[PDB]
Design a binder for this molecule. Sequence first.
Ligand SMILES: Nc1ncnc2c1ncn2[C@@H]1O[C@H](COP(=O)(O)O)[C@@H](O)[C@H]1O
Ligand SMILES: CC(C)(CO)[C@@H](O)C(=O)NCCC(=O)O
Ligand SMILES: CC(C)(CO)[C@@H](O)C(=O)NCCC(=O)O
Lengths: 253, 256
Amino acid sequence: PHLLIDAGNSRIKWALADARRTLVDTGAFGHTRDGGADPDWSRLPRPRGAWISNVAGADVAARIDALLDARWPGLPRTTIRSRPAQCGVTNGYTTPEQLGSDRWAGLIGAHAAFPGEHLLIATFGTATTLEALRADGCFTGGLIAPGWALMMRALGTHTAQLPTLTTDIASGLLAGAQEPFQVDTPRSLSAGCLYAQAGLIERAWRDLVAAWQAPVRLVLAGGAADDVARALTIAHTRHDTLILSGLALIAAD
Amino acid sequence: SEPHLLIDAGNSRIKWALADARRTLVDTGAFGHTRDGGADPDWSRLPRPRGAWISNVAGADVAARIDALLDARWPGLPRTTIRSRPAQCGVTNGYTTPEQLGSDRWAGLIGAHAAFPGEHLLIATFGTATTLEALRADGCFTGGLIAPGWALMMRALGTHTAQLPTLTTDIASGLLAGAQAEPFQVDTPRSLSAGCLYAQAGLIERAWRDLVAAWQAPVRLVLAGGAADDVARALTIAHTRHDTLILSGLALIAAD
Ligand SMILES: Nc1ncnc2c1ncn2[C@@H]1O[C@H](COP(=O)(O)O)[C@@H](O)[C@H]1O
Ligand SMILES: CC(C)(CO)[C@@H](O)C(=O)NCCC(=O)O
Ligand SMILES: CC(C)(CO)[C@@H](O)C(=O)NCCC(=O)O
């Protein structure tokens, strides 16, 4: 009975896993700066403890603590950090702790979910992160880029004439369009940023395949994966619980 | 005998050129915005132009600053601010609403049409944003796309994440120089630098291959802007470097 928390820069994801690490309850809530509400932990049993992954800063760390203290007073909690090696995975970062804890947990989750496979993990959040993971557990390196939403948001705030589009709006725009090349501003913007994601991933995957001279499964995770997958001309696999599954394994050990 | 002053004002820098004949760029330069502590252009050695032709995508404040700079240096100088048209100088605007196309992209399209006669083009321009335009040999601008630039991508990561710092292109380029650059990185600043850069290159390569496959004909990739050098290294496909596209377009407009 462990509570797991995946705090990112855009929102805070949580889950409750039993003895068999089955995520019996899941949920998500936004940050206070974005008018985010609190999580509904009313119909939730008292966990033995809480395991936290937080890359969203000290204020979020404090808020999470307050939430736990309000619901379950004095609940045991642990904030995880990236380790040189853990749960079958080795950290290839020159300075292992520098790696985002969410990326670390996701690696641990992916290692278990796809045993005996080389992987390219594409996670779509505030940032788009890529990780190369060998079957033997070796995390050999990665890439970091802004996510689809962030790219368009950046265009809207740092130019005078470009509109600020949400992924909801952007996704609908591309649905009615017929290809990277568009004949209007919001579609050019939406397609330009989307194919920056697809182009990044596709180039990385072919680079990884050519480097390891072996099959590599491309794993996609995150809400934006839906829209990015539709532009991909290479095979891909969806798996949206890698981070929370990893936290379960970390909590279990 | 009368020279033309050409202004290309973007969201990051304001580029200018003094032009002779049809499109001969005699003097050139650039300067930053007031909000960035940018200085004023050195026009102290320039003769009085016949007029100024301006492309501005950076708003009314910048437009007012440019007018003020011109009024101070050359009082009474005629000025023209350009807007994207349905068709001009051999180029046909494929935009649903032609006027919505960035005037800098329009001028650049006009310059590319003249600079590469008889060729199908993919134009990659690197500024605050990275913009692509597909241009037919006959002059048909059939479509394009807009993505954030290399610097903007990293700035966005720096401001909207708690644990990532902001890297400049100078810092990123220095960290990725030589054997430092890899398909994947093992530290945060290089992973950040490479990820955004490979997003640039990846975007261009994807759009280029799709265009060639679509038109089923040769397509010349043309690069313009400051970040082009770094992006070029990341490219595995061939490319042509041609930075004066926009200023040449303005010159051709001013000559006509
Ligand atoms: N792309 C262009 N090329 C040449 N002249 C232009 C262009 N855009 C605008 N102008 C001129 O600028 C003035 C004002 O333009 P507008 O505000 O669009 O009516 C008019 O004299 C137009 O003919
Ligand atoms: C890159 C993000 C913001 C993506 O969530 C996060 O994983 C993070 O803060 N990482 C720290 C820097 C690094 O992973 O190299
Ligand atoms: C895309 C930028 C910002 C590049 O300078 C500029 O060309 C612009 O403001 N364009 C307006 C929208 C469009 O060109 O479709």
